[PDB]
User: Which sequence fits this backbone?
RNA sequence: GAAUGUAGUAUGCGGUCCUUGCGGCUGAGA
């Protein structure tokens, strides 16, 4: 029964809610589902369209309705501090003012651990790799796709060796191919499933995954959304990114940002499609940079398709630097 | 070829022992 301890720390406010919408707290079930999704996406490149094999290996690692999960995840210590922070891309409907909407959320920092345990070393390594990929390449909680809930590891104590912590942009980009190679080798050794079937992933996976970098900051206080006015001169990194997103000049589209090149709830069609771009914030050597993770897939959603070049032309317009690939 | 009575199927005996209502699921999408 090997163990692995992860001491997380949120650099941006986390919006993770239980049954009570107003009260926000760290949830083991939500993060476990997120790790399941991240393992499916990260190992999707090794599987491609092999849905059945991916489902089999997922039911092996994380359990199913016929076998208990061999990975047990529990949050032990939570030094949280409930506070109020505004939504990234949601503004109130106030007459004239129309300021942001600030719900309760976990304050930045709030170092809380997260304990991993498993009876098999390989499954523990797989879970740790999926969780570290989730922590690095995205956030957890509400509005995670628009720069919220991202965390970084403050301490590590595990038995099974894992990938080293990146120190700059180049190491972070190389970590993608690293983790992909390690999970591919581990899966081929243990499960011995299909060896990288040649097909674009029908879902969000690492088969077509690109990492982008945009902007840099040195003070965390000037990172998240602070100014409630566009004309304000105290726009932070998140605020400046939102202002650039609002400018229709950068992205070339008929409807601009209001088209279906992003999350489904925009316009007449409600649907449930999320934004392929996963906006996040990463700190590299005490320097904070906006992480723009984009997942390209063969089909956007059953029923319609969209042009992916709008995202890439938008990234090139505001000078987003592609670190991977 | 004639010439019943008296009597409790009763005495003693634990439907008990061993069994996690468990397994799997992002309060999230813009």
Assistant:
């Amino acid at each position: 029964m090997y163990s692995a301890t992860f001491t997380l720390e949120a650099i941006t406010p986390v919006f993770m809610r239980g049954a009570n919408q107003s009260k926000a707290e760290i949830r083991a079930a939500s993060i476990k589902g997120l790790m399941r999704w991240w393992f499916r996406a990260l190992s999707g490149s090794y599987f491609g369209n092999d849905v059945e094999g991916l489902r089999r290996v997922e039911e092996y690692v994380f359990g199913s309705t016929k076998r208990e999960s061999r990975v047990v995840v529990e949050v032990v210590k939570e030094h949280v501090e409930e506070r109020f922070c505004p939504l990234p891309m949601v503004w109130k409907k106030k007459k004239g003012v129309t300021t942001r909407v600030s719900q309760r959320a976990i304050a930045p920092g709030s170092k809380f651990t997260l304990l991993l345990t498993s009876d098999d070393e390989e499954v523990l390594k797989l879970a740790c790799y999926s969780l570290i990929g989730l922590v690095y390449f995205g956030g957890i909680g509400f509005r995670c796709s628009r720069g919220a809930g991202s965390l970084k590891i403050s301490s590590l104590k595990s038995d099974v060796q894992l990938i080293d912590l990146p120190k700059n942009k180049n190491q972070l980009g190389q970590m993608v191919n690293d983790l992909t190679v390690e999970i591919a080798k581990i899966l081929k050794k243990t499960f011995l499933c299909d060896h990288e079937n040649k097909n674009c992933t029908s879902y969000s996976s690492f088969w077509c995954f690109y990492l982008f970098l945009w902007g840099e900051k040195a003070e965390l206080e000037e990172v998240y959304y602070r100014s409630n006015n566009l004309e304000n001169e105290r726009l932070t990194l998140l605020d400046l990114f939102e202002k650039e997103f609002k400018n229709k000049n950068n992205h070339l589209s008929n409807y601009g940002y209001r088209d279906f090149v992003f999350g489904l709830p925009r316009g007449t069609k409600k649907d449930r499609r999320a934004s392929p771009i996963k906006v996040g914030i990463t700190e590299l050597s005490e320097k904070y940079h906006v992480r723009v993770s984009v997942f390209k897939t063969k089909i956007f959603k059953p029923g319609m398709n969209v042009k992916w070049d709008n995202i890439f032309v938008f990234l090139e317009n505001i000078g987003a630097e592609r670190i991977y690939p």
